[PDB]
Each structure stands twice: as structure tokens, then as C-alpha cells.
CSV table of C-alpha atoms and ligand atoms in Angstrom, one decimal:
chain,number,residue,atom,x,y,z
A,6,UNK,CA,-70.3,-16.2,-41.6
A,7,UNK,CA,-68.8,-15.5,-38.2
A,8,UNK,CA,-65.1,-16.4,-38.8
A,9,UNK,CA,-61.8,-15.2,-37.5
A,10,UNK,CA,-59.2,-13.4,-39.4
A,11,UNK,CA,-59.1,-9.5,-39.2
A,12,UNK,CA,-58.8,-7.3,-42.2
A,13,UNK,CA,-56.0,-5.4,-40.5
A,14,UNK,CA,-54.0,-4.7,-37.4
A,15,UNK,CA,-50.7,-6.5,-37.2
A,16,UNK,CA,-47.1,-6.1,-36.0
A,17,UNK,CA,-45.2,-8.3,-36.3
A,18,UNK,CA,-42.8,-9.0,-33.5
A,19,UNK,CA,-39.2,-9.4,-34.4
A,20,UNK,CA,-37.1,-12.5,-34.7
A,21,UNK,CA,-34.0,-10.5,-33.9
A,22,UNK,CA,-31.4,-10.8,-31.2
A,23,UNK,CA,-29.6,-7.8,-29.8
A,24,UNK,CA,-28.5,-6.4,-26.4
A,25,UNK,CA,-24.8,-5.5,-26.9
A,26,UNK,CA,-24.6,-2.4,-24.6
A,27,UNK,CA,-21.0,-1.3,-23.9
A,28,UNK,CA,-20.3,-0.9,-21.1
A,29,UNK,CA,-17.1,1.0,-20.2
A,30,UNK,CA,-14.6,-1.4,-21.6
A,31,UNK,CA,-11.1,-1.4,-23.2
A,32,UNK,CA,-8.5,0.6,-21.2
A,33,UNK,CA,-11.3,2.5,-19.4
A,34,UNK,CA,-11.3,-0.5,-17.1
A,35,UNK,CA,-7.9,-1.4,-15.6
A,36,UNK,CA,-7.6,2.4,-15.2
A,37,UNK,CA,-10.4,3.0,-12.7
A,38,UNK,CA,-9.1,-0.1,-10.8
A,39,UNK,CA,-5.5,1.0,-10.5
A,40,UNK,CA,-6.7,4.6,-9.8
A,41,UNK,CA,-8.8,3.2,-6.9
A,42,UNK,CA,-6.1,0.9,-5.5
A,43,UNK,CA,-3.4,3.6,-5.4
A,44,UNK,CA,-5.9,5.8,-3.5
A,45,UNK,CA,-6.0,3.0,-0.9
A,46,UNK,CA,-2.2,2.8,-0.3
A,47,UNK,CA,-2.1,6.6,-0.3
A,48,UNK,CA,-4.7,6.4,2.5
A,49,UNK,CA,-2.2,4.1,4.2
A,50,UNK,CA,1.1,5.7,5.3
A,51,UNK,CA,-1.0,8.4,6.8
A,52,UNK,CA,-2.5,6.1,9.3
A,53,UNK,CA,-0.1,3.2,9.7
A,54,UNK,CA,2.8,5.7,10.0
A,55,UNK,CA,0.8,7.8,12.4
A,56,UNK,CA,-0.2,4.8,14.6
A,57,UNK,CA,3.6,4.1,14.9
A,58,UNK,CA,4.0,7.5,16.5
A,59,UNK,CA,1.3,6.9,19.2
A,60,UNK,CA,2.9,3.4,19.7
A,61,UNK,CA,6.1,5.0,21.0
A,62,UNK,CA,4.1,7.2,23.3
A,63,UNK,CA,2.5,4.0,24.7
A,64,UNK,CA,5.9,2.6,25.5
A,65,UNK,CA,6.9,6.1,26.7
A,66,UNK,CA,4.7,6.0,29.8
A,67,UNK,CA,6.1,2.6,30.7
A,68,UNK,CA,9.7,3.8,30.6
A,69,UNK,CA,9.2,7.0,32.6
A,70,UNK,CA,8.1,4.7,35.5
A,71,UNK,CA,9.8,1.5,36.7
A,72,UNK,CA,12.5,2.7,38.7
B,4,UNK,CA,9.7,-11.8,-29.5
B,5,UNK,CA,7.6,-8.7,-29.3
B,6,UNK,CA,4.5,-10.6,-30.4
B,7,UNK,CA,5.0,-13.2,-27.7
B,8,UNK,CA,3.9,-10.6,-25.0
B,9,UNK,CA,0.7,-10.1,-27.0
B,10,UNK,CA,-0.1,-13.6,-28.4
B,11,UNK,CA,-0.1,-15.4,-25.1
B,12,UNK,CA,-2.1,-12.6,-23.5
B,13,UNK,CA,-4.9,-13.5,-25.9
B,14,UNK,CA,-4.8,-17.2,-24.7
B,15,UNK,CA,-4.0,-17.3,-21.0
B,16,UNK,CA,-4.0,-13.9,-19.2
B,17,UNK,CA,-3.9,-15.7,-15.8
B,18,UNK,CA,-0.2,-16.4,-15.1
B,19,UNK,CA,0.7,-13.2,-17.0
B,20,UNK,CA,-1.0,-11.2,-14.3
B,21,UNK,CA,1.0,-13.2,-11.8
B,22,UNK,CA,4.4,-12.5,-13.3
B,23,UNK,CA,3.4,-8.8,-13.6
B,24,UNK,CA,3.0,-8.7,-9.9
B,25,UNK,CA,5.9,-11.1,-9.2
B,26,UNK,CA,7.9,-8.6,-11.2
B,27,UNK,CA,7.8,-4.9,-10.1
B,28,UNK,CA,8.0,-6.1,-6.5
B,29,UNK,CA,11.6,-7.2,-6.2
B,30,UNK,CA,12.6,-4.2,-8.3
B,31,UNK,CA,11.2,-1.3,-6.3
B,32,UNK,CA,13.1,-1.6,-2.9
B,33,UNK,CA,16.3,-0.8,-4.9
B,34,UNK,CA,14.6,2.4,-6.2
B,35,UNK,CA,12.7,4.7,-3.8
B,36,UNK,CA,14.3,6.6,-0.9
B,37,UNK,CA,11.3,5.8,1.2
B,38,UNK,CA,13.2,2.6,2.2
B,39,UNK,CA,16.0,2.9,4.7
B,40,UNK,CA,13.6,5.2,6.5
B,41,UNK,CA,11.7,1.9,7.0
B,42,UNK,CA,14.9,0.9,8.9
B,43,UNK,CA,15.3,4.3,10.5
B,44,UNK,CA,11.8,4.3,12.0
B,45,UNK,CA,12.3,0.7,13.1
B,46,UNK,CA,15.6,1.4,15.0
B,47,UNK,CA,14.5,4.2,17.4
B,48,UNK,CA,11.4,2.4,18.9
B,49,UNK,CA,12.5,1.7,22.5
B,50,UNK,CA,11.5,-1.7,23.8
B,51,UNK,CA,13.9,-2.2,26.7
B,52,UNK,CA,15.0,0.3,29.4
B,53,UNK,CA,17.9,2.8,28.8
B,54,UNK,CA,20.5,2.0,31.5
B,55,UNK,CA,22.7,5.0,32.2
B,56,UNK,CA,26.5,5.3,32.1
B,57,UNK,CA,29.2,6.8,34.4
B,58,UNK,CA,31.4,9.8,34.2
B,59,UNK,CA,35.1,8.9,34.1
B,60,UNK,CA,37.4,11.4,32.5
B,61,UNK,CA,35.0,11.8,29.6
B,62,UNK,CA,32.2,13.3,29.8
B,63,UNK,CA,31.8,12.9,26.0
B,64,UNK,CA,28.2,14.5,25.9
B,65,UNK,CA,24.7,14.0,27.4
B,66,UNK,CA,24.7,15.2,31.1
B,67,UNK,CA,22.2,14.1,33.8
B,68,UNK,CA,19.4,16.3,32.5
B,69,UNK,CA,17.7,14.6,29.5
B,70,UNK,CA,15.8,17.6,28.2
B,71,UNK,CA,19.0,19.5,27.6
B,72,UNK,CA,20.2,19.5,23.9
B,73,UNK,CA,22.2,16.4,24.5
B,74,UNK,CA,21.1,13.4,22.4
B,75,UNK,CA,20.8,12.5,18.7
B,76,UNK,CA,18.3,13.5,16.1
B,77,UNK,CA,15.1,11.4,16.5
B,78,UNK,CA,12.8,14.4,16.8
B,79,UNK,CA,12.2,14.6,13.0
B,80,UNK,CA,9.3,12.2,13.4
B,81,UNK,CA,7.1,14.7,15.4
B,82,UNK,CA,7.6,17.2,12.5
B,83,UNK,CA,6.8,14.3,10.1
C,101,LIG,C1,10.0,-16.0,-16.5
C,101,LIG,C2,10.3,-14.6,-16.1
C,101,LIG,C3,9.8,-14.3,-14.7
C,101,LIG,C4,10.2,-12.9,-14.2
C,101,LIG,C5,9.6,-11.8,-15.2
C,101,LIG,C6,9.6,-10.5,-14.5
C,101,LIG,C7,8.3,-9.7,-14.7
C,101,LIG,C8,7.9,-9.6,-16.2
C,101,LIG,C9,6.5,-9.2,-16.3
C,101,LIG,C10,5.7,-10.2,-17.1
C,101,LIG,C11,6.2,-10.3,-18.5
C,101,LIG,C12,5.5,-11.5,-19.2
C,101,LIG,C13,5.9,-12.8,-18.6
C,101,LIG,C14,6.0,-13.9,-19.7
C,101,LIG,C15,5.0,-15.0,-19.4
C,101,LIG,C16,5.2,-16.2,-20.3
C,101,LIG,C17,4.8,-17.5,-19.6
C,101,LIG,C18,3.7,-18.2,-20.5
C,101,LIG,O1,3.4,-17.8,-21.5
C,101,LIG,O2,3.2,-19.4,-20.0
C,101,LIG,C19,3.4,-20.5,-20.9
C,101,LIG,C20,2.8,-21.7,-20.1
C,101,LIG,C21,1.4,-22.0,-20.5
C,101,LIG,O3,1.2,-23.3,-20.9
C,101,LIG,P1,-0.3,-23.9,-21.2
C,101,LIG,O4,-0.6,-24.1,-22.6
C,101,LIG,O5,-0.5,-25.2,-20.4
C,101,LIG,O6,-1.4,-22.8,-20.6
C,101,LIG,C22,-2.1,-23.0,-19.4
C,101,LIG,C23,-2.0,-21.8,-18.5
C,101,LIG,N1,-3.0,-21.8,-17.4
C,101,LIG,C24,-2.7,-22.8,-16.4
C,101,LIG,C25,-3.0,-20.5,-16.8
C,101,LIG,C26,-4.3,-22.0,-18.0
C,101,LIG,O7,2.9,-21.5,-18.8
C,101,LIG,C27,4.0,-22.1,-18.1
C,101,LIG,O8,4.7,-22.9,-18.7
C,101,LIG,C28,4.3,-21.8,-16.6
C,101,LIG,C29,3.1,-22.1,-15.7
C,101,LIG,C30,3.6,-22.1,-14.3
C,101,LIG,C31,3.6,-20.6,-13.8
C,101,LIG,C32,3.9,-20.6,-12.3
C,101,LIG,C33,3.5,-19.2,-11.7
C,101,LIG,C34,4.6,-18.6,-10.8
C,101,LIG,C35,4.0,-17.9,-9.6
C,101,LIG,C36,4.6,-16.5,-9.4
C,101,LIG,C37,6.1,-16.7,-9.0
């Protein structure tokens, strides 16, 4: 008279299938990308242009000597 | 033809991204006035040495003192 099945206490667990979490898609991407990339080239032309100014100063000390 | 730019971008968006960067690259140097400053910066960077000239009649400009108001306008870069 000592046998298994309980009178109660059950679930069940699902048979389902779901993890579609979105996700920042669909014109949200391709907009943060271009907005990041244009910040890069804007951070250029303030350094590459400025290094071009110090470049001429480096040639300047050459030319003021050599006679 | 207006569906062809949307019914090949559902099949192969690989070369479409190439032509989009191939285009809008040849077009822009004919557009912005930032170019020809790219040739203006690149002209007044002295590599060699400035040899002087001689007075003979003229005397056009630019006497023996360099810091006089004598030469052309390349001093807009320090203000830039
Ligand atoms: C042709 C005009 C070029 C200048 C355009 C100026 C910029 C315009 C901005 C882009 C507008 C849209 C461009 C239309 C693209 C149509 C081409 C197409 O659908 O491919 C069909 C077919 C697709 O045939 P498929 O069925 O074999 O697809 C396979 C495609 N891949 C390999 C990506 C999986 O492609 C081609 O025939 C050409 C492939 C060679 C491309 C060489 C790349 C050039 C490199 C840069 C220079």
C-alpha cells in the first residue's frame, strides 16, 4: 500500500518556444551608426588640419637656419 | 523601375551597399567649397628654400625686411 502517485501538486512545464526580444531594429539601427561615424570625421579636420599647422612650424626652424 | 531599388535589396543587400558608397563619392568634390582649400593649404607648405631676387629698376614690392607688410595672404591659417 506504499505506492507512488501524489494526490496533487503539479505544474506542468510548457512545451512553448519564445524569446523574440526586439531589440532596437528598423531605422533605429543605420541611424546610430551614421550618427557615430559622422562624429568621427568631425573629430577629424580639427586634428589633421591642426597637425598641418605645426608641420609648417617644423619646416620653419629648418629654413630660418641654413645660410 | 521604382520597385527594382526595393526588390533586389530584399535579396542581395551586399553589392547595393557598395554602389551606395561608390556613388556619393565621385559626386561630392564638385559640391562643397571645402575643396580648393585642399589645394590652397597644399600650395603654401614650403619644402625648399626661398632664394631671393635682385633690385633692377623695379622694385615691384617686398623689400629686404620680411616682417614688413610685403608678401601675400597666407596668414589666414593662424586665424583658422
Ligand atoms: C550601375 C550604376 C553604378 C553607379 C550608381 C551610382 C550610385 C547609385 C547608388 C546605388 C543605387 C542602386 C544600385 C543598383 C544595383 C543593381 C545591381 C544588382 O542588382 O545586382 C544584380 C546582380 C546580382 O546577380 P546575382 O543573382 O548573382 O546575385 C549575387 C550577388 N551577390 C554576389 C552579392 C550575392 O549583380 C551584378 O550583376 C553585378 C555584380 C558585380 C558588382 C561589382 C561591384 C562593383 C564594386 C564597386 C565599384
